[PDB]
Amino acid sequence: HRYRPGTVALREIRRYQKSTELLIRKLPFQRLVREIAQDFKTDLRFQSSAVMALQEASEAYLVALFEDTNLCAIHAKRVTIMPKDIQLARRIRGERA
């Protein structure tokens, strides 16, 4: 049949919140990191452990940011996070100007 819109999302929330495995596949993330790093210095090497630490920190930060964003969107009587929500969150945090 069909699941009503908005149900499979709840299942996935239960699913992902119970595990801890990283959610971004490694290789694209690593290539992004190397691209970004290149702009500060040429011919640079990275310990895989360093890349893993970068990914850990980045994903944890993103999850926290989304938590705050969902909180904002709920406050705005909404259920769909929208860019303005992230902007408000970061602004209050003090990260964005």
Partner DNA sequence: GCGCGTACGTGCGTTTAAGCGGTGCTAGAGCTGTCTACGACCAATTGAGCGGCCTCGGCACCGGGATTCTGATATCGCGCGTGATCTTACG
Partner DNA sequence: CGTAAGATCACGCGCGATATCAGAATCCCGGTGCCGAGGCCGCTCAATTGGTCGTAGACAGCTCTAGCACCGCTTAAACGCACGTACGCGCTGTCC
Q: Which residues bind another protein (CB under 8 A)?
A: 6-7, 9-10, 12-20, 23-25, 28-29, 31-38, 40-41, 43-47, 49-50, 52-54, 56-67, 69-71, 73-74, 79-83, 86-87, 90, 94, 96
Q: How far apart are CA 13 and CA 8, in angstroms?
A: 9
Q: How far apart are CA 57 and CA 65, in angstroms?
A: 12
Amino acid at position 24, single letter:
I
Q: Which of the choices another protein, a copy of itself, DNA, none does residue 1 contact, using the CB cut-off of 5 to 8 A by kind?
A: DNA
Q: Give the distance from CA 50 to its chain's centroid.
A: 18
Residue list 58-87, contact with a copy of itself (CB under 8 A): 68, 71-72, 75-77, 84-85
